Amino acid sequence: ITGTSTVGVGRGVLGDQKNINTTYSTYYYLQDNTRGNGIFTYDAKYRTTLPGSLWADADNQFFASYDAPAVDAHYYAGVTYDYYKNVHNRLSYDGNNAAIRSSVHYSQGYNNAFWNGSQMVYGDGDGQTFIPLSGGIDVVAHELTHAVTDYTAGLIYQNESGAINEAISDIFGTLVEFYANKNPDWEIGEDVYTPGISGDSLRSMSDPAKYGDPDHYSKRYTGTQDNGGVHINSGIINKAAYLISQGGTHYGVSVVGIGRDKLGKIFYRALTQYLTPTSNFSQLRAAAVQSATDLYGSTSQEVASVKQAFDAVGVK
Ligand SMILES: O[C@@H]1[C@@H](O)[C@H](O)OC[C@H]1O
Ligand SMILES: O[C@@H]1[C@@H](O)[C@H](O)OC[C@H]1O
Ligand SMILES: O[C@@H]1[C@@H](O)[C@H](O)OC[C@H]1O
Ligand SMILES: O[C@@H]1[C@@H](O)[C@H](O)OC[C@H]1O
Ligand SMILES: [Ca+2]
Ligand SMILES: [Ca+2]
Ligand SMILES: [Ca+2]
Ligand SMILES: [Ca+2]
Ligand SMILES: [Zn+2]
């Protein structure tokens, strides 16, 4: 909508207060004009018609329980935009400041979030498996990274290319979480997963096997569930990325960590320069090696650590 840019305040899913960029035109809309061509947050009103209604508020104060998922989807979309612009010089998910749109209150008791090819969508959870999923910055960044992937490598969402697609979203979801620097970890979804169970998460990058996901290529799932296990075999790549950044000895193979920033530069370059829709795990290794070579040289520790990490998870 056309209006004047202003700043509101509210509370997110976890009860934390934050300011949000809004637009005033009779009502205050969750429309942030300070980033690219706008960040727009919508209310699906417990239905599945998308995008729903652009979120309208009468007084620019968003402290109602019903407001919280919108606050966080809107705010964390902005953080993720900032990450890609400030860290990778990428303007929104298409590189040309495409508008970022998010809908919350999707359906009833919906225990998931997703990028639908045009926008992000967040369920409220059922209060047992999940609370509203936009409360997790790694979830928000995970989904928006799917958009980045769709506009760059275009990894098909099945089998190994789909598992890479998932891992990329977990990797940059985590790197955005570290970028914002509020309780950062190498776990996925911990902030919105199982409110009645402490210390758990949906996936682990540091130890995928914690939740039954493979941490080595020999353990990859080869059935048909989950589009060929795209959320399962992602653990193999998540572990490799974790090792590149943090180091460790995995199945007896030692990896010297090079830190989160260099992990991001290597995998972002791989994603945007070398990966293709049909890339498999072995092609990802080559892409990451070439990216590290571009950035730091063929004889660098960085290239060495990329090789060790993929060796450690059995990807040749
Ligand atoms: O879980 C939902 C909650 O996030 C919202 O605030 O009010 C409706 C609930 O279904
Ligand atoms: O209570 C909710 C209210 O906060 C919102 O503004 O409109 C929908 C209602 O369910
Ligand atoms: O607020 C209620 C919400 O919790 C549920 O998801 O659908 C019915 C609504 O009235
Ligand atoms: O999937 C397994 C899980 O069920 C168990 O609790 O801990 C080990 C995991 O491999
Ligand atoms: Ca209000
Ligand atoms: Ca965390
Ligand atoms: Ca996390
Ligand atoms: Ca939990
Ligand atoms: Zn995903």
Side-chain angles (χ1 to χ4, degrees):
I1 189 175
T2 306
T4 191
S5 298
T6 182
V7 179
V9 65
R11 271 192 291 269
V13 174
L14 277 50
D16 55 324
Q17 182 176 307
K18 56 197 69 176
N19 297 331
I20 42 269
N21 296 110
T22 60
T23 298
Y24 181 59
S25 182
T26 303
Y27 287 94
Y28 297 92
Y29 290 90
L30 292 185
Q31 163 177 333
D32 169 12
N33 305 305
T34 72
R35 294 174 167 100
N37 291 294
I39 296 176
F40 304 79
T41 298
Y42 299 74
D43 187 10
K45 308 182 175 173
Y46 303 130
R47 302 190 67 94
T48 61
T49 292
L50 297 174
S53 309
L54 187 65
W55 195 286
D57 186 89
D59 64 5
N60 212 21
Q61 299 182 35
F62 302 77
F63 293 101
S65 180
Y66 190 84
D67 302 335
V71 171
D72 279 345
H74 197 63
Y75 183 94
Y76 291 144
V79 174
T80 309
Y81 177 97
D82 290 349
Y83 171 81
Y84 276 110
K85 178 173 184 289
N86 296 336
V87 177
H88 300 294
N89 193 38
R90 186 184 190 82
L91 298 178
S92 191
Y93 53 87
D94 70 338
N96 196 33
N97 273 329
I100 298 171
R101 309 184 189 278
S102 308
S103 301
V104 299
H105 295 312
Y106 178 78
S107 195
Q108 295 186 25
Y110 189 71
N111 286 320
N112 221 324
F114 57 95
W115 167 265
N116 79 341
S118 314
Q119 62 161 107
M120 276 92 84
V121 186
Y122 300 95
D124 292 328
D126 59 19
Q128 295 276 120
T129 314
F130 286 98
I131 58 178
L133 281 88
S134 57
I137 182 173
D138 56 356
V139 173
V140 173
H142 174 108
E143 306 300 353
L144 183 50
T145 295
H146 279 308
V148 178
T149 294
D150 286 6
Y151 274 86
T152 55
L155 296 152
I156 308 312
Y157 206 66
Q158 71 183 355
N159 302 334
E160 292 194 10
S161 65
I164 297 166
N165 188 321
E166 271 303 310
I168 292 291
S169 279
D170 283 344
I171 291 166
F172 288 107
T174 289
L175 291 177
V176 170
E177 184 174 309
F178 272 95
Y179 173 79
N181 194 37
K182 198 173 77 186
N183 299 321
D185 53 53
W186 295 84
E187 315 299 297
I188 305 297
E190 67 283 348
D191 288 339
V192 295
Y193 188 59
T194 54
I197 303 177
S198 276
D200 66 342
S201 62
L202 186 54
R203 294 184 286 279
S204 180
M205 302 184 69
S206 57
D207 181 18
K210 191 170 172 171
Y211 303 111
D213 294 329
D215 61 7
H216 191 276
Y217 192 68
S218 71
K219 299 182 172 298
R220 71 192 181 278
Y221 171 80
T222 60
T224 62
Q225 304 311 111
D226 188 30
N227 288 288
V230 297
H231 296 98
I232 298 176
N233 294 327
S234 57
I236 295 161
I237 304 303
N238 285 346
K239 183 68 183 183
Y242 171 84
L243 292 170
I244 291 173
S245 180
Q246 304 302 100
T249 305
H250 185 53
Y251 291 108
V253 177
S254 293
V255 187
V256 178
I258 60 176
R260 293 182 305 266
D261 293 349
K262 289 173 179 183
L263 172 71
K265 300 298 284 187
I266 289 163
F267 271 72
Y268 182 78
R269 186 169 184 84
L271 178 70
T272 59
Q273 294 302 323
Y274 292 120
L275 293 180
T276 73
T278 59
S279 298
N280 61 30
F281 284 7
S282 285
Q283 287 166 316
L284 172 61
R285 177 189 171 123
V289 172
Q290 185 63 60
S291 298
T293 296
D294 296 346
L295 294 168
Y296 311 108
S298 58
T299 74
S300 63
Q301 179 65 73
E302 290 80 355
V303 169
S305 295
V306 170
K307 289 174 176 172
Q308 282 298 109
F310 280 97
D311 283 349
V313 301
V315 173
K316 297 299 183 299

